[PDB]
């Protein structure tokens, strides 16, 4: 199943991006006066609300590499959601042409 | 219909998450000085703008369990939207191969 390979890998990729992104955000934001994304617990929640595109604004990067990490977290969460949605649609379609009599 | 089972259950799940999430957010935010997500009416609107990923930033949790509840509200609204979109696509596809002559 190709659609389950792409969705399954993207979700694994997303988890790696969320954890590494939380780590790399703190590493890139510290050293910049005024930054508030400087502790791992709340940086872990920031990566989730970034990947899900919620983006409250309570937490955000101010540096270049912090923003580059943010972009990666944005793209990873969006593409993973696009692949899973696509994989679900083909799963339902193939399931629907079955149950009738089409294999 | 499997795609209507998954979309129909997800929307029901979303309503449960929205109501319980509004309740659990207030319960988890009270006791934390500075929290503003501490009354049920506006916490009910916060769960909607969280599940829809709008996230104005007028309201957001500051505690651990408040943020954990927020994550659940984020994921519930996103996956429900992914299943309904998938269910619509298969519904249109099956409707399109009909009307021609394919059953």
């Amino acid at each position, epitope marked *: 199943a190709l659609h389950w390979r792409a969705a399954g890998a993207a979700t694994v990729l997303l988890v790696i991006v969320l954890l590494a992104g939380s*780590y790399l955000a*703190v*590493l890139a*934001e*510290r*050293g*910049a*006066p*005024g*930054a*508030q994304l*400087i*502790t*791992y*617990p709340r940086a872990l929640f920031w990566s989730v609300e970034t990947a899900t595109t919620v983006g409250y604004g309570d937490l955000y990067p101010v540096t270049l590499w912090g923003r580059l990490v943010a972009v990666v977290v944005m793209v990873a969460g969006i593409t993973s959601f696009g692949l899973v949605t696509a994989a679900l649609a083909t799963w339902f379609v193939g399931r629907e042409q079955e149950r009738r009599g089409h294999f | 219909a499997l795609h209507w089972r998954a979309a129909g259950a997800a929307t029901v799940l979303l309503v449960i998450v929205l109501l319980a999430g509004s309740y659990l957010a207030v319960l988890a935010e009270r006791g*934390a*000085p*500075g929290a503003q997500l501490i009354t049920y009416p506006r916490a009910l609107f916060w769960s909607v703008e969280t599940a829809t990923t709008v996230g104005y930033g007028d309201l957001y949790p*500051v505690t651990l369990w408040g943020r954990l509840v927020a994550v659940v509200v984020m994921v519930a609204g996103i996956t429900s939207f992914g299943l309904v979109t998938a269910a619509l696509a298969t519904w249109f596809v099956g409707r399109e191969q009909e009307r021609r002559g394919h059953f």
Partner: antibody
Amino acid sequence: QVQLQQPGAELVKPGASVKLSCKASGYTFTSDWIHWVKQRPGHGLEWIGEIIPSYGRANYNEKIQKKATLTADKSSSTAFMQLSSLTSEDSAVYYCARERGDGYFAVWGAGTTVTVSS
Amino acid sequence: DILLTQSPAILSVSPGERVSFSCRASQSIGTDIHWYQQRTNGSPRLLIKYASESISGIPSRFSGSGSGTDFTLSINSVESEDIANYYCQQSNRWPFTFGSGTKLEI
């Protein structure tokens, strides 16, 4: 079981340098930050800089003059601070502290009494 | 940066009396304040992390409160071992800063 072990004291000639150490026992996570705090006799706590040994990146106090250079050795779990070009104004007690990346200094060292005199 | 002002410099109190130190920040820092104790010729010791939450090993005698720009460390019934220097530290913004300190005398 001192988690952060520092030498007792260090004597430095005016204008010379010294390499302070901070051997770390206990749990050593990849999210650990080692902070260095300067304290003059009869004075308060002053933040010098931080370093994450798992990555090797260090930050410093911009409001003061850069006298320190932070390094680390993951194989021996020991962070180092290089105080160069010392005057009498650099004579103080230098602590090292371990932060779990959650903001607070959970464990401190005994401090090293650095004296700059001829 | 964020300056932390501690008042008063020296705090006199009778034994068995509830005392309170004050830590105030230049700007709103939520609850990201931490309290430390330093006795004579000793190293700082964490008493309170994140304004109000306690630390294992530290007596229930110590308690903290406040949010925004006004923080308070309280001691129910001060005894002789409480005589030390008390500091507050913020972690809300980079860089971490310390308070000027408050000495306790009985």
